[PDB]
Design a protein around this motif. Structure first.
Motif, PDB file in Angstrom:
ATOM      1  N   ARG A  94      -9.371  -0.983  23.440  1.00 20.48           N
ATOM      2  CA  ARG A  94      -7.799  -0.858  23.620  1.00 20.48           C
ATOM      3  C   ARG A  94      -7.357   0.530  23.650  1.00 20.48           C
ATOM      4  O   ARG A  94      -6.419   1.092  23.522  1.00 20.48           O
ATOM      5  N   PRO A 132      -1.378  -6.427  48.872  1.00 22.78           N
ATOM      6  CA  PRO A 132      -1.484  -5.795  47.593  1.00 22.78           C
ATOM      7  C   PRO A 132      -2.046  -6.408  46.188  1.00 22.78           C
ATOM      8  O   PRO A 132      -2.230  -5.837  44.954  1.00 22.78           O
ATOM      9  N   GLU A 135      -5.051  -5.023  43.751  1.00 17.68           N
ATOM     10  CA  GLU A 135      -4.771  -4.412  42.817  1.00 17.68           C
ATOM     11  C   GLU A 135      -5.345  -5.346  41.315  1.00 17.68           C
ATOM     12  O   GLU A 135      -5.543  -4.619  40.176  1.00 17.68           O
ATOM     13  N   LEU A 136      -5.254  -6.566  41.693  1.00 16.01           N
ATOM     14  CA  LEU A 136      -5.205  -7.332  40.417  1.00 16.01           C
ATOM     15  C   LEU A 136      -6.394  -7.660  39.621  1.00 16.01           C
ATOM     16  O   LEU A 136      -6.468  -7.772  38.540  1.00 16.01           O
ATOM     17  N   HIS A 139      -6.789  -5.584  36.715  1.00 14.76           N
ATOM     18  CA  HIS A 139      -6.122  -5.842  35.519  1.00 14.76           C
ATOM     19  C   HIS A 139      -6.248  -7.009  34.769  1.00 14.76           C
ATOM     20  O   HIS A 139      -6.258  -7.153  33.434  1.00 14.76           O
ATOM     21  N   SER A 143      -7.364  -7.729  30.686  1.00 12.66           N
ATOM     22  CA  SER A 143      -6.662  -8.574  29.907  1.00 12.66           C
ATOM     23  C   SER A 143      -7.608  -9.075  28.711  1.00 12.66           C
ATOM     24  O   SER A 143      -7.128  -9.357  27.731  1.00 12.66           O
ATOM     25  N   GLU A 146      -6.656  -7.929  24.991  1.00 12.89           N
ATOM     26  CA  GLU A 146      -5.694  -8.751  24.181  1.00 12.89           C
ATOM     27  C   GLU A 146      -6.096  -9.941  23.703  1.00 12.89           C
ATOM     28  O   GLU A 146      -5.450 -10.890  23.504  1.00 12.89           O
ATOM     29  N   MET A 147      -7.376 -10.191  24.001  1.00 16.66           N
ATOM     30  CA  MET A 147      -7.838 -11.766  23.867  1.00 16.66           C
ATOM     31  C   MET A 147      -8.717 -11.823  22.369  1.00 16.66           C
ATOM     32  O   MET A 147      -8.633 -12.614  21.625  1.00 16.66           O
ATOM     33  N   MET A 169     -14.384 -17.063  32.718  1.00 17.65           N
ATOM     34  CA  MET A 169     -12.664 -17.383  32.886  1.00 17.65           C
ATOM     35  C   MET A 169     -12.299 -16.420  33.637  1.00 17.65           C
ATOM     36  O   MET A 169     -11.789 -16.535  34.640  1.00 17.65           O
ATOM     37  N   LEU A 170     -12.359 -15.196  33.243  1.00 14.95           N
ATOM     38  CA  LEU A 170     -11.851 -13.934  33.783  1.00 14.95           C
ATOM     39  C   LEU A 170     -12.271 -13.552  35.206  1.00 14.95           C
ATOM     40  O   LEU A 170     -11.301 -13.113  35.982  1.00 14.95           O
ATOM     41  N   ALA A 173     -10.965 -16.134  37.518  1.00 17.81           N
ATOM     42  CA  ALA A 173      -9.286 -15.844  37.819  1.00 17.81           C
ATOM     43  C   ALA A 173      -9.331 -14.470  38.846  1.00 17.81           C
ATOM     44  O   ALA A 173      -8.490 -14.389  39.708  1.00 17.81           O
ATOM     45  N   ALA A 176      -9.808 -15.978  41.926  1.00 17.23           N
ATOM     46  CA  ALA A 176      -8.477 -17.108  42.279  1.00 17.23           C
ATOM     47  C   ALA A 176      -7.492 -16.324  42.670  1.00 17.23           C
ATOM     48  O   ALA A 176      -6.856 -16.677  43.835  1.00 17.23           O
ATOM     49  N   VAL A 177      -6.985 -15.149  42.191  1.00 13.03           N
ATOM     50  CA  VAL A 177      -5.823 -14.450  42.571  1.00 13.03           C
ATOM     51  C   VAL A 177      -5.715 -13.677  44.008  1.00 13.03           C
ATOM     52  O   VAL A 177      -4.737 -13.453  44.457  1.00 13.03           O
TER      53      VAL A 177
ATOM     54  N   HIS B 139      -0.773 -13.060  30.278  1.00 10.37           N
ATOM     55  CA  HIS B 139      -1.701 -11.758  30.215  1.00 10.37           C
ATOM     56  C   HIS B 139      -1.536 -11.124  31.637  1.00 10.37           C
ATOM     57  O   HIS B 139      -1.168  -9.673  31.899  1.00 10.37           O
ATOM     58  N   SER B 143       0.361  -7.217  32.680  1.00  4.62           N
ATOM     59  CA  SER B 143      -0.328  -6.469  33.581  1.00  4.62           C
ATOM     60  C   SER B 143       0.774  -5.352  34.135  1.00  4.62           C
ATOM     61  O   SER B 143       0.491  -4.161  34.562  1.00  4.62           O
ATOM     62  N   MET B 169       4.557 -10.810  43.147  1.00  4.35           N
ATOM     63  CA  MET B 169       3.009 -10.765  43.403  1.00  4.35           C
ATOM     64  C   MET B 169       2.296 -11.179  41.940  1.00  4.35           C
ATOM     65  O   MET B 169       1.756 -12.429  41.992  1.00  4.35           O
ATOM     66  N   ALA B 173       0.394 -14.815  41.285  1.00  2.00           N
ATOM     67  CA  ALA B 173      -0.813 -14.918  40.720  1.00  2.00           C
ATOM     68  C   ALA B 173      -1.051 -15.518  39.514  1.00  2.00           C
ATOM     69  O   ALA B 173      -2.060 -16.214  39.161  1.00  2.00           O
ATOM     70  N   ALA B 176      -1.580 -19.071  41.071  1.00  2.00           N
ATOM     71  CA  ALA B 176      -3.223 -18.984  41.619  1.00  2.00           C
ATOM     72  C   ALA B 176      -4.035 -18.933  40.634  1.00  2.00           C
ATOM     73  O   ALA B 176      -4.995 -20.098  40.715  1.00  2.00           O
ATOM     74  N   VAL B 177      -4.355 -18.311  39.532  1.00  2.00           N
ATOM     75  CA  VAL B 177      -5.206 -18.437  38.515  1.00  2.00           C
ATOM     76  C   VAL B 177      -5.344 -20.109  37.965  1.00  2.00           C
ATOM     77  O   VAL B 177      -6.379 -20.248  37.233  1.00  2.00           O
TER      78      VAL B 177
END
Lengths: 199, 199
Positions: A94, A132, A135-136, A139, A143, A146-147, A169-170, A173, A176-177, B139, B143, B169, B173, B176-177
């Motif tokens: 953080r 675009p 970019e995800l 990010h 996350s 914050e978990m 999981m992340l 994801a 997935a996105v 989360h 972002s 977007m 997402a 999507a996730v």
């Protein structure tokens, strides 16, 4: 070692209080040493904080660089970074959120961070082209900050035999996105890279 | 108004310097008023900062509460929150990242934030059941804080006729996730809710 004790104490203080409010005196009084002994190891609070910032990103850059098709590569990289961020006593991830790290004092960190960000983006572009959504993944990776807990117990000790759920999981994801298909046995495939790299 | 000028000046300072380093003197010298005039409006820097924190979440809670099936509901809520965070002069969304907001001084903010978080989670649970991915939409929404500018120009002015790309977007997402299907004309459907609510 003494240096490691200072870093651990400082990671606790910086992550709970921020940068400005934390002093070399508090860090030293928390380690149970005199201030002069802190100064033997570090010119100031600024160097301590930089060291911690680097730990968050240089290992991933080194590993992320060294890491199969693009889905598997991205998945492994996301999982490893999230794995790294869950492996530490305090939530040092953080620290980049503090507005002070905007200052040019920390330009070294900036460079290292944009280099890591680039690695994520270019991998994702291999998957979705000029979209675009590229970019995800970065990010989504971040996350985890914050978990997790920040009470001093490590969320998930590093293991050669498993990946923690949150990293799985992340990383799922992150693909997935992008509409990308999630590879079979991705946990085992990833673990192999980590054995490869870390020797 | 004068109060609004203080808030704007403070949002600029807090978002660039953090909380501890910012003083009532700097805020007043930046607005071009005497310190006594600041104190007429606010007991201290702490109240100013709280006001800004609330602006980040109370509007979304009010709207998020007031918001069709679960996919559309979640999509609209994500888009609206991201829309709100892109609508302001300064990036006041990053204020919750400051470690000081951990203190009980800001317990009011905590409550409001967990209430908003709950709204996202319960909507997502309507979609994927007892699946840890339910945590992710919030989360993903947040972002946007690391995406937008903070130089004083508003990323995307609020409009009744459109949604900015980043809100689109990120809301895409967020579904999507969860493996959820993205509804047709979701931008127009969302815009309707906003007209409904905001009267």
């Amino acid at each position: 070692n003494p240096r490691e004790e200072i870093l651990d104490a400082s990671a606790e203080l910086f992550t709970h209080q921020g940068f400005a409010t934390t002093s070399t005196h508090q860090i030293a009084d928390a380690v149970g040493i005199r201030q002069a002994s802190l100064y033997y190891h570090f010119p100031s609070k600024t160097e301590i904080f930089l060291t911690l910032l680097k730990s968050t990103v240089e290992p991933s850059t080194v590993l992320a660089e060294d890491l199969a098709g693009p889905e598997m590569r991205l998945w492994a990289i996301v999982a490893s970074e999230v794995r790294l961020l869950l492996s530490t006593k305090w939530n040092v991830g953080r620290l980049y959120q503090l507005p002070i790290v905007g200052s040019e004092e920390f330009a070294e960190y900036h460079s290292q961070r944009e280099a890591l960000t680039n690695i994520f983006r270019d991998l994702a572009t291999e998957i979705v082209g000029d979209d675009p959504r590229a970019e995800l993944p970065f990010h989504i990776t971040m996350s985890v900050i914050e978990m997790r807990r920040n009470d001093g117990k490590i969320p998930s000790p590093l293991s050669a035999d498993s990946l923690p759920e949150t990293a799985i999981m992340l990383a799922d994801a992150s693909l997935a996105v992008l509409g990308a298909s999630l590879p079979a046995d991705r946990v085992e495939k990833t673990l192999e890279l980590i054995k490869q790299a870390d020797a």
